[PDB]
């Protein structure tokens, strides 16, 4: 399973931003990564936001799971 998780980061990193393979990241898949937010993080050209801001968005929702048991707070219903 080690060659399974190692081929997740390697494949993802090349595809997400940058690597005949180095200039493939020069156009970048940042145009593919762009459409998720709205438009506004446009500065990803050489300081690439959507390359980095996906890992940090993954590390937040991964740490939302551990905190969920402690801060329950929910009634016998749903919120607004």
């Amino acid at each position: 399973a080690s060659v399974v998780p190692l081929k997740d980061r390697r494949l993802l990193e090349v595809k997400l931003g940058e690597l005949d393979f180095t200039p493939s990241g020069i156009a970048g898949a940042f145009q593919r990564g762009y459409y998720r937010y709205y438009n506004k993080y446009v500065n990803v050209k050489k300081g690439s936001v959507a390359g980095l801001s996906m890992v940090l968005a993954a590390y937040v929702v991964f740490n939302y799971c551990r905190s969920y048991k402690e801060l329950k707070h929910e009634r016998l219903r749903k919120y607004h």
Binding site: L56, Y59, V60, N63, Y64, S67
Partner: protein
Amino acid sequence: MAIHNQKGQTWSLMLMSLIMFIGSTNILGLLPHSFTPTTQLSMNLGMAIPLWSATV
């Protein structure tokens, strides 16, 4: 690098690794529900003493 200017410049290639670790692990934790290892007082007493007594 500029201050030392000795044959104690060999030590300085480590000191820029020390700045990127607690430069990052203090900047990650500003996120919504993240956790910083330099919050706990345990490892910082293992960052001072093996470095400070490496000087004397």
